[PDB]
């Protein structure tokens, strides 16, 4: 199976500025007939994917001349001369030279803004939940930027990762920040076996671990 590699997975842009996305294939896409089967699709939120470019550089009917596809062999590029709000979404490259066709992982366009440290909050299980036998510890890391954040749950010093659910909001429409939720669910017994619960985030806004903890006492 042909491995398609896109970069970056997240492209920070500024409305009015140009954008460039890369797509590299594990093997050459030049087929035996002189044609290179590579297309680009844009998936706007809530929408279905829509092809914008085909055969490397042919623009689909309607596609603004702001879009330009290029490349050859195993290296291809999609350029936007000046990003507009309508261009926001997820862009995919797909090859059709090798069976079966495979898509790149996708490149989401996000708005650029200044770095913002996250506001971290940690919460112990509720007595209601403990009555039901479970114990979910929740951590909120809010309004940070960029999107890249490394969160670890440290229980009395050691990282534990048994029963975890993480959810991320879409980039905020107003302040362009990101927020994240991390829930560590243990059984009531497992929970009562430890004392210090810690939500630890590694983010570019700090050379030190951003932590918030609580002791079961």
């Amino acid at each position: 199976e042909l491995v398609m590699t896109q970069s970056p997975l997240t492209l920070s842009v500024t409305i009015g500025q140009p954008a460039s996305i890369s797509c590299k294939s594990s093997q050459s896409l030049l087929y035996s007939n002189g044609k290179t089967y590579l297309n680009w699709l844009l998936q706007r939120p809530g929408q279905s994917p829509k092809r914008l470019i085909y055969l490397v550089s042919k623009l689909d009917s309607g596609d603004p001349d702001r879009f330009t596809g290029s490349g050859s062999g195993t290296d291809f590029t999609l350029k936007i001369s000046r990003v507009e709000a309508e261009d926001l979404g997820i862009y995919y490259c797909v090859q059709g030279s090798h069976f079966p066709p495979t898509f790149g992982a996708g490149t989401k366009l996000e708005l650029k803004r200044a770095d913002a440290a996250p506001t971290v909050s940690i919460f112990p299980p509720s007595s209601e939940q403990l009555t039901s036998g479970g114990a979910s510890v929740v951590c909120f890391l809010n309004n940070f930027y960029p999107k890249d954040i490394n969160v670890k749950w440290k229980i009395d010093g050691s990282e534990r990762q048994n029963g975890v659910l993480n959810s991320w909001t879409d980039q905020d429409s107003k302040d362009s920040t990101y927020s994240m939720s991390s829930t560590l669910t243990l059984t009531k017994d497992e929970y009562e076996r430890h004392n210090s619960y810690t939500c630890e985030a590694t983010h570019k806004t700090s050379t030190s671990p951003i932590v918030k903890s609580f002791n079961r006492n």
């Binding site: 898509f103 112990p124 979910s136 909120f140 939720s181 829930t183």
Partner: protein, 216 residues
């Protein structure tokens, strides 16, 4: 041109399901009909294609024992049947055309694979663990755990608390959905003033409130 796809499907794991894609605006039997997949927050996967002229099929081997493609030329409808679907098969299924004559995608069909019956969420309060208050602001929240099917609607103080709110997208885990929501208010507002999340779950006809009581 237009590809009309059938409605959302709730499928029990290990059983089966069949989706349709009705085409119009072009000659159905003149081009291959593709079927794609997009699992939760993931990328795109090409399942295979069928040519309605002779029902000839080319399948991504990865789905050979998963997808069966058929067609009904009478109503120019394409069908994809999934055998023994698992939780890993939950996703949005798309039928599409991508050829020299055109590039069109249906609106997509959501398939959720779960054995869960309608289940109201267990709403739990998220109150600070009596750990410092040096902060000018206070963040509280509600954990909306184990509900099905999606979705639920969460408000704070019946819509009185709007800004400072983050209601995270639900994650389908172990047949059930779980979602959380946070709200931030000044220290002078809570707990002197009551803060309550209101979780409404349409499917189970329930709407419950959960007041956030200060950590005793």
């Amino acid at each position: 041109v237009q590809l009309q796809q059938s409605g959302a499907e709730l499928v029990r794991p290990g059983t089966s399901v069949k989706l349709s894609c009705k085409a119009s605006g072009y000659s159905f039997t003149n081009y291959w009909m593709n079927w794609l997949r997009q699992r939760p927050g993931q990328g795109l996967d090409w399942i295979g294609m069928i040519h309605p002229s002779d029902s000839e099929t080319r399948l991504n081997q990865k789905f050979k024992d998963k997808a069966t493609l058929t067609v009904d030329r009478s109503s120019s409808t394409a069908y994809i049947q999934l055998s023994s679907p698992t939780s890993e098969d939950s996703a949005v299924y798309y039928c599409a055309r991508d050829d020299y004559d055109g590039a069109f995608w249906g609106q997509g069909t959501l398939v959720t694979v779960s054995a869960a019956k309608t289940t109201p969420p267990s709403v739990y309060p998220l109150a600070p663990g009596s750990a410092a208050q040096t902060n000018s602001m206070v963040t509280l929240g509600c954990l909306v755990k184990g509900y099905f099917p999606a979705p639920v609607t969460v408000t704070w103080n019946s819509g009185s608390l709007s800004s400072g709110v983050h209601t995270f997208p639900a994650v389908l885990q172990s047949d059930l959905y779980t979602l959380s929501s946070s709200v931030t208010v000044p220290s002078s507002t809570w707990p002197s003033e009551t803060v309550t999340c209101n979780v409404a779950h349409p499917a189970s006809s329930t709407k419950v409130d959960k007041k956030i009581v200060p950590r005793d």
